[PDB]
Amino acid sequence: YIVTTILEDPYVMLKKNANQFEGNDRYEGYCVELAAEIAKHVGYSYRLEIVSDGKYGARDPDTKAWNGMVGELVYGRADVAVAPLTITLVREEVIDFSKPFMSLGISIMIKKPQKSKPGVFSFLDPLAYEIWMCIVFAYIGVSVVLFLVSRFSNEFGIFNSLWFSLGAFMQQGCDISPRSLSGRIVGGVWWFFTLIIISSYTANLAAFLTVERMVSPIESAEDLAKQTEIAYGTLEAGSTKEFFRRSKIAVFEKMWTYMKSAEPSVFVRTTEEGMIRVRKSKGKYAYLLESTMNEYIEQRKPCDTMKVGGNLDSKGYGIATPKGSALRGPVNLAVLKLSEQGVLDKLKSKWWYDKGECGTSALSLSNVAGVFYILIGGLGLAMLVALIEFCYK
Amino acid sequence: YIVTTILEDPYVMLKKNANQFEGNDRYEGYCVELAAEIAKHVGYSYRLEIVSDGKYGARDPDTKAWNGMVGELVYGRADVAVAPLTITLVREEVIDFSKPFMSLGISIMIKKPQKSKPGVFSFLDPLAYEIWMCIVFAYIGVSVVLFLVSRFSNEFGIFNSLWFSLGAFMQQGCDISPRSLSGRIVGGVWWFFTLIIISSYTANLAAFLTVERMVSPIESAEDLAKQTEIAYGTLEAGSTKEFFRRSKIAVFEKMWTYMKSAEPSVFVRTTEEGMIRVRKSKGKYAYLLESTMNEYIEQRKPCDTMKVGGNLDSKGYGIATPKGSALRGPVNLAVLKLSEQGVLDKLKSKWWYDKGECGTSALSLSNVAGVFYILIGGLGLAMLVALIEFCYK
Amino acid sequence: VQVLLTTIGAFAAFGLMTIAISTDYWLYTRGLTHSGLWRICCLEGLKRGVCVKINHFAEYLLRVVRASSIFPILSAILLLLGGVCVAASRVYKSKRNIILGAGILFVAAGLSNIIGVIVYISANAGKNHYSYGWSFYFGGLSFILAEVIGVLAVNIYIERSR
Amino acid sequence: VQVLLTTIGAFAAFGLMTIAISTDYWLYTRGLTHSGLWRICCLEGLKRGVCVKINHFAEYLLRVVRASSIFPILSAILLLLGGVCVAASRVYKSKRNIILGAGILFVAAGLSNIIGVIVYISANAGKNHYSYGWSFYFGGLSFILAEVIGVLAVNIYIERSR
Amino acid sequence: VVTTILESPYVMMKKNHEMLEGNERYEGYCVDLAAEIAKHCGFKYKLTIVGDGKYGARDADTKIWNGMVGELVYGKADIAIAPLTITLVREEVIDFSKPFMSLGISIMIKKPQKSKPGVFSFLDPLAYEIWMCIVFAYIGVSVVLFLVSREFGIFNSLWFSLGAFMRQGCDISPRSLSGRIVGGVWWFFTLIIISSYTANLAAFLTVERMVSPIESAEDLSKQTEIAYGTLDSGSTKEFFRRSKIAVFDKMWTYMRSAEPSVFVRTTAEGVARVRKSKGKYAYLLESTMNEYIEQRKPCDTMKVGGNLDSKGYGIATPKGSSLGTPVNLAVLKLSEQGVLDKLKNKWWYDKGECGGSKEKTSALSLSNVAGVFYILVGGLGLAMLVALIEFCYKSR
Amino acid sequence: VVTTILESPYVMMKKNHEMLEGNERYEGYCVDLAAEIAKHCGFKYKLTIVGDGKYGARDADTKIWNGMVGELVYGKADIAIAPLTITLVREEVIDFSKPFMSLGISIMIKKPQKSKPGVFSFLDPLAYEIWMCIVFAYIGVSVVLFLVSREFGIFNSLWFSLGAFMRQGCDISPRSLSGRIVGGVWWFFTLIIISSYTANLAAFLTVERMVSPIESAEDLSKQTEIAYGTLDSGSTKEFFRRSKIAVFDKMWTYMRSAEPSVFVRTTAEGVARVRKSKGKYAYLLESTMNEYIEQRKPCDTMKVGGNLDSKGYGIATPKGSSLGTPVNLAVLKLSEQGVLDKLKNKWWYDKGECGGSKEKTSALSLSNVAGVFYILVGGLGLAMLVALIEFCYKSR
Numbered sequence A, B: 001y002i003v004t005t006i007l008e009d010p011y012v013m014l015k016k017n018a019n020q021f022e023g024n025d026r027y028e029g030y031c032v033e034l035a036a037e038i039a040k041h042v043g044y045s046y047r048l049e050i051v052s053d054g055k056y057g058a059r060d061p062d063t064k065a066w067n068g069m070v071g072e073l074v075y076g077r078a079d080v081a082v083a084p085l086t087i088t089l090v091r092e093e094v095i096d097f098s099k100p101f102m103s104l105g106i107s108i109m110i111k112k113p114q115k116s117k118p119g120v121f122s123f124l125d126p127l128a129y130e131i132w133m134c135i136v137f138a139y140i141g142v143s144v145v146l147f148l149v150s151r152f153s154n155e156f157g158i159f160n161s162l163w164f165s166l167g168a169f170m171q172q173g174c175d176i177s178p179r180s181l182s183g184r185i186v187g188g189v190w191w192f193f194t195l196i197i198i199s200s201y202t203a204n205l206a207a208f209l210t211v212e213r214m215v216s217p218i219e220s221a222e223d224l225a226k227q228t229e230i231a232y233g234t235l236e237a238g239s240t241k242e243f244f245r246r247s248k249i250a251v252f253e254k255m256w257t258y259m260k261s262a263e264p265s266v267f268v269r270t271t272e273e274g275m276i277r278v279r280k281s282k283g284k285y286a287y288l289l290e291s292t293m294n295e296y297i298e299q300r301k302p303c304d305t306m307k308v309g310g311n312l313d314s315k316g317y318g319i320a321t322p323k324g325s326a327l328r329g330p331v332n333l334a335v336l337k338l339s340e341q342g343v344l345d346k347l348k349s350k351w352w353y354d355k356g357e358c359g360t361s362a363l364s365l366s367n368v369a370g371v372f373y374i375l376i377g378g379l380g381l382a383m384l385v386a387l388i389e390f391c392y393k
Numbered sequence C, D: 001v002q003v004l005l006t007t008i009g010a011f012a013a014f015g016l017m018t019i020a021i022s023t024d025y026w027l028y029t030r031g032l033t034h035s036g037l038w039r040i041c042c043l044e045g046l047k048r049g050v051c052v053k054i055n056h057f058a059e060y061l062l063r064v065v066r067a068s069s070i071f072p073i074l075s076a077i078l079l080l081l082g083g084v085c086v087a088a089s090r091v092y093k094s095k096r097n098i099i100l101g102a103g104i105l106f107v108a109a110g111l112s113n114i115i116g117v118i119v120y121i122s123a124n125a126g127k128n129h130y131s132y133g134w135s136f137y138f139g140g141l142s143f144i145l146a147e148v149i150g151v152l153a154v155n156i157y158i159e160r161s162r
Numbered sequence E, F: 001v002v003t004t005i006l007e008s009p010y011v012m013m014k015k016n017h018e019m020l021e022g023n024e025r026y027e028g029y030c031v032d033l034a035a036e037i038a039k040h041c042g043f044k045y046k047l048t049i050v051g052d053g054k055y056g057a058r059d060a061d062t063k064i065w066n067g068m069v070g071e072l073v074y075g076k077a078d079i080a081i082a083p084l085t086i087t088l089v090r091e092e093v094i095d096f097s098k099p100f101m102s103l104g105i106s107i108m109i110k111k112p113q114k115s116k117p118g119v120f121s122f123l124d125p126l127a128y129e130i131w132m133c134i135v136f137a138y139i140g141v142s143v144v145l146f147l148v149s150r151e152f153g154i155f156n157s158l159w160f161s162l163g164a165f166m167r168q169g170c171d172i173s174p175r176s177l178s179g180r181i182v183g184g185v186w187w188f189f190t191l192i193i194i195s196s197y198t199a200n201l202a203a204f205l206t207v208e209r210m211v212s213p214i215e216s217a218e219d220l221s222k223q224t225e226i227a228y229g230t231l232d233s234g235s236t237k238e239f240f241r242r243s244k245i246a247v248f249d250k251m252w253t254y255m256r257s258a259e260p261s262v263f264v265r266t267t268a269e270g271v272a273r274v275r276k277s278k279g280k281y282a283y284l285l286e287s288t289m290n291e292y293i294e295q296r297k298p299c300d301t302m303k304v305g306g307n308l309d310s311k312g313y314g315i316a317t318p319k320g321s322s323l324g325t326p327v328n329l330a331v332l333k334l335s336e337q338g339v340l341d342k343l344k345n346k347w348w349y350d351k352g353e354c355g356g357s358k359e360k361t362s363a364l365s366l367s368n369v370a371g372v373f374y375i376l377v378g379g380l381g382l383a384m385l386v387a388l389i390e391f392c393y394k395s396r
């Protein structure tokens, strides 16, 4: 017998060093292992052959000339076919389909949220840089004026008046209080300044954390239906866009209503180039495709994608041989023999995951980590000041 | 000429002391004044007469026996009719309708939110009563233990140790610090207690005000469509429920889908008794009706209702006289003469509003008002303590 | 004179604690259920007087501390030994270490009682609200007195020593 | 000795303030626009050197305080009179009320300068972000020096009086 | 022959009009409305545009009608399905159908957007009533402390209650039992006022509410701040002139004696004047067009309040009307089914520029805190002045 | 003759079944599914219930089939439209159609609800890593202060940095320039830690997140805390026994050697065991029924993770199948149109008990603050003990 199959990703691909390979040892993949299992159970030797056209199977509207995998089966160049091919009412008439082995669905593919490592100084975010600058200038000007009016022809020396101004802002009481009227009035305004700046910082940081925790990612297709910022488009032509046109559903009719009228062309010609458009946007564009292809794209190649949400559409792959075949009997039951015992499930685990190249909500240490560097650096200078004034005396 | 009209609310109602009244002086209302204006412009004397059936106008499906206002017009007992009567395809064939004078629509009627006067002590809401009780007990037990271990065979007397414990909780520094080890260890735990209780109170009050300001009332019909807690129902039978059945709209098809299957009977037989069901629920049930009737119900009778949102359906009242009438000419143009100059608009302002019996988001003074009563009461006792110890010495 | 006033307050605080654990009027829950500490008594319904014991059964450890009123009973034992210690100071006078011992027990009685209140409110809590009965405030009033008896005992110990 | 160090710092602070209001390098906004205080100079595009004056026009009152650099110029007038007052103390010695006057003007220069900074940032603010040029930090550095010159002037006045 | 008129939302010429000749040249609401009428009427429709570019008004000099109204009476046009207002003088010359949609005169303003926080913008959390009550109370507690005492004088007592409210620990402590009842009670006040401030300020920066300055037509009758007018000469301009009720009579007093005159030539000029002024001019026109302008790009205006008058559009037919009877009944049936509401929802709302609201908390700028900085440096300069004259007078 | 079987969501007997005799007696998904099949098939349908109340399995002793499967092979039933799983042994005896819906074995658990905060529940805002870092740092600052100085000893220096973190003003102040660099830097640490605590605690009480303890099937393979099993004997029980992959082989090890045996007689008993246990037992069954039970009253369970195996239901027809060909093609067309998805959305989701989320902030109870009260009274009792032995040893 002869096997008619198509080359696409992990199902069928030519083996490494294909120049030094002859026969069935020239190919490797998922469908390769499936062809080996069924040929033993039914009992016939096979010969693997790639399709001539390179298409799945479609008939021209004028002349009924079937081009692809099903076209080679109609007149009968090969015995049976093992390829990822969906079942349709149009396909069921001309070619006889067997029981489904793997179930597929339409799912969502977005750019994987990168591990947002917090800034080592991400605790000075509430107040802008030009405010932090003017607090330092004010602190100097307040102490100098206090120093002047305190001692005039007094405990508030140039060293002591500088120590009083820090203790007031840090909210750590005081050692000595201004005694005169001129010293009291400048002390009262510095107390009024401190109380507002501190209370404004706490209230803004409270608002910053409250907003950040009450955000939800694009989970279900309902979340896509009520969003305009994050765009979503399908292939230019296929079974995906054709389903969307005659979609008599809840809010998927409104989904296609938005898809038709867009500023740029949301519909992408190439599927692989369509995956690049999601990478380029970086959390601005989403791409809808089959679940089986979506899961494999996350594993192989650099990791910047993931599957999200449940399956939307219901479609299944199958094994096809033209109607009036005596090969339907033993093959259809063999497919059920593989599934129930668990041959397909072990094999699907191997080529996707085993042959793959990928894989508490309290305040973290990293958010506060910055203020510990300020604590150590201060004690570093403290030791040096003790080192200098010991050598002097 | 003879006028055929129906009695319903401010359109037509019998005058006060109707026993001592003869002719057109026996009735008073809106349509009474409309009948007076048109009779002068066209030029004929009239005689007002109430309908026999007491219905608006409906034909039986078996025998075409029209019962109500339109039934009296078909065979011709009266010349013309001035009553609040909607226009339909069924009504347009048998009776000739004039140009509309007043436009109506279906609107929403809910229980009026009562002026929520804040509690005079609505600032002790964040913490429950049994917590405020145990802070007082702890305050006593802390001072007594501090008093004991401080002086033992010392500035911390029974009066001074009681003053230290208050100053720590109020966060107002300290006069004298514990000198011994036994006095320090009990002082450290009371400092750790204070810092958590205060910070928990501020954070809970922050959450209480944040939630209270981000709440939206039931404004549009879209808000009704996505709510289950607040129920909404119409009349048992009429033009309102009949419109809902063959409603090919956005989310009003889903609105009737919920209306059909309810736990209790959402559809009320009586309209006036239906208004009582909204009062009894108190912000749990809504009643849909005509906008004209809804606005009048807010004005007359005790005020516990209001109109909210825009009009949904499009319907207009008219003035009807049977087809093949020569009275259509001067009346139809007179209706347009009243509307354009502004006779209807002045008259509608009188009977609804003129003859009616109804009618910054910072922290308020009332929310803090309670803590001022604590301030004055304390100074009241302060004067009495000075009064007692002056008479003693 | 003031030492004789201490004995009266010691027996008073001892009484109010004993009445508290005796009477079954600590809480109300909905018809009307006048429950105390050891026995839940029902009123206004089918059985009007027919009462029965409580069926109680980190979370496991607090349950047994409520089931056995270990703290409030200890408070009374500390308190009645306190009043006994004051009577032991009356006869065989001039020891200079008698009322001191009593003073610690009265302070310890309140510090034992204050736990018993916190444990009871923690156990009760898991819409009609619960209300605290008269016999609960008897336990609250006894804490205040025992604390006042405690500080009085310290003043006498200071006077004799100086 | 230390009084001679005061004169050098007075002229230094006087210089840095004069360079600041002279050079047009206070802000950058987007190609590249090296704007100062009085003249907005453009670079990298069509006109490379062709500059023109600023077209500026409660909210009305702050606009005229920015349009006329009233505070930073006043700071310099206070500062240069300060250094002059120290030179007036050198000749005709033993007055005991000379450097005191200068010390107040240096403190007033900084307290005038600190307003001029706040007004400038308030006027600028109403997506590419603005960056502060080198000639802005010249105004920032001049405030620190004048404050240090001010406190030095007080120490000399205390020394002669005592 | 079907006579129509070129409008913004009703009759629009489609892109590539030279490529598609016939009824494919135009697309809109009024095109589909004609097809619904001819579904129950045996008539052949041809999309013919009126050459004059006018609705219809009899001139004062000639006393002859023009446009779609002129073509009807003189006998050229067969049927007229266009946005045409049904008035008194039109009914005398041509017969009209029943209204298919209702409209009125409404108010439009520029979107409220976000305000710039000037100076003393940090006193927003609390009411102006509370701030003054804290000032009076602080004097009361200070004065009572002195009288209770009789060291604490008038000056020393005021300082204690200032340092108490700022929540800094000094060395001043009332030693009297009476004074410690005053101190502890004044402390509990301080603890609640500070905690209440911080909580209310956090709520402002979590969710921001942009509320409209005007609500109703009676609102801008009292406010009298923002300019309001209509077209130089039109339907809404003639309505304002002849008014019976006092509220619009007071409005026409403003509209007539305006400095300068608030009137524009075109309706397109009126929309442009509102957006450019930025909360300074408010335009008054039909509620139909106003709702379409709000949905169209780039979205910077919205409808406010209810309608003032109640008018409607209909289908016009020449005098006699031999074919005007059946099409009048057909529209009334399609009004009941909900086809008019379905078609209006397609062109107004469905085909629009602006429809998800995502809010992000931004860092605080210096401009909104600027208020407290002026108070600090202002207080510093005052302290130098008092210290100098205290020494100057003591010297003499 | 159309043979079906009595299920929960598929074939339901309508209320007042005595009043309505015929096809009005029943209502559900499987009733409307038969009407969709007979829309393209020339056959007369009569709602006939199988008397056995069994799906179909050949007995070990008799070697004869029963129920709907038994009626098909022996020649009594014509067509079978019912939830029937398509297995190997069924295909040998009767022909099956193409799958109309897909299903698998999934995990269900009781709703997560809200937890009771016990003791030390106030340390939730900050991580356990930060708390211990503050303890170590406070010793470091206290020790450095002593070494910098050389009054300040070891005991006196430790007290200063404790009183500094609690933010109370004492009479202890470092007089050395070196010590004032230590003091001021330790102060800035205190200010940020206190302000960061208050902010994070406010976020917890604004919006509450109830997160599931288990996510996947590999999650409850490692957790090994909550009990999980299936029916005593069924389809899912037979799947667990014969497994190739290690993850379910380790699960069957738990399922077999369970103490006690976690197996129930009926599927209705399994649901009751999950709700009563309250996060102690997890039940495994078909994803179809699981989704229906979640939508039904009073809503206390939900679906978690993906499906383990992939099975499907079909339409069964006797051996030979002379009328089984066209109805197989008809279902495939109705699958494409989206009638199966429309009908499943009507009975599962549309007709349900629980569908608006309105949150209201409640007052804090004593139980959640209880932690700090035990620390207070515990510390008080310890202070009395140290003071007594300090006097007792000094006496001798």
Ligand SMILES: CCCCCCCC/C=C\CCCCCCCC(=O)OC[C@H](O)CO
Residues within 6 Å of the ligand: A119, A121, A124, A129, A136, A139, A169
């Ligand atoms: C009252 C006296 C206390 C005043 C103490 C002032 C605190 C020190 C400020 C910045 C450190 C310099 C940080 C430089 C390191 C670069 C990374 C960084 O932190 O950037 C800053 C930016 O604002 C965020 O990203």
Ligand SMILES: CCCCCCCC/C=C\CCCCCCCC(=O)OC[C@H](O)CO
Residues within 6 Å of the ligand: B119, B121, B124, B129, B136, B139, B169
């Ligand atoms: C540290 C020492 C300071 C402790 C000071 C404790 C504050 C006083 C508490 C309640 C006043 C009594 C109020 C009684 C008036 C009835 C209305 C009311 O306020 O109700 C309370 C309820 O918790 C809300 O509604």
Ligand SMILES: NS(=O)(=O)c1cccc2c1c([N+](=O)[O-])cc1[nH]c(=O)c(=O)[nH]c12
Residues within 6 Å of the ligand: A008, A056, A084, A085, A086, A087, A238, A239, A271, A289, A290, A292, A293
């Ligand atoms: N490569 S793809 O992006 O995923 C993909 C895109 C578009 C159509 C596909 C298809 C795949 N497939 O999974 O290889 C299989 C398949 N089978 C059919 O029978 C059919 O009609 N269309 C397709």
Ligand SMILES: NS(=O)(=O)c1cccc2c1c([N+](=O)[O-])cc1[nH]c(=O)c(=O)[nH]c12
Residues within 6 Å of the ligand: B008, B056, B084, B085, B086, B087, B238, B239, B271, B289, B290, B292, B293
């Ligand atoms: N009283 S009501 O609650 O508002 C009311 C309820 C139900 C039907 C009404 C109706 C009123 N109406 O305004 O008096 C007028 C009216 N006119 C018609 O022609 C018709 O068919 N039905 C009605």
Ligand SMILES: NS(=O)(=O)c1cccc2c1c([N+](=O)[O-])cc1[nH]c(=O)c(=O)[nH]c12
Residues within 6 Å of the ligand: E007, E055, E083, E084, E085, E086, E234, E235, E267, E285, E286, E289
């Ligand atoms: N464009 S407009 O600003 O809204 C407008 C302004 C002024 C008059 C209008 C008018 C419109 N309209 O809606 O196109 C229709 C219309 N129809 C009539 O019959 C008539 O007399 N006057 C008008």
Ligand SMILES: NS(=O)(=O)c1cccc2c1c([N+](=O)[O-])cc1[nH]c(=O)c(=O)[nH]c12
Residues within 6 Å of the ligand: F007, F055, F083, F084, F085, F086, F234, F235, F267, F285, F286, F289
């Ligand atoms: N009720 S159940 O819990 O889900 C359930 C449990 C166990 C076996 C089932 C079954 C259902 N089912 O969905 O009604 C259908 C079905 N059909 C078959 O053909 C078969 O062999 N076994 C079953």
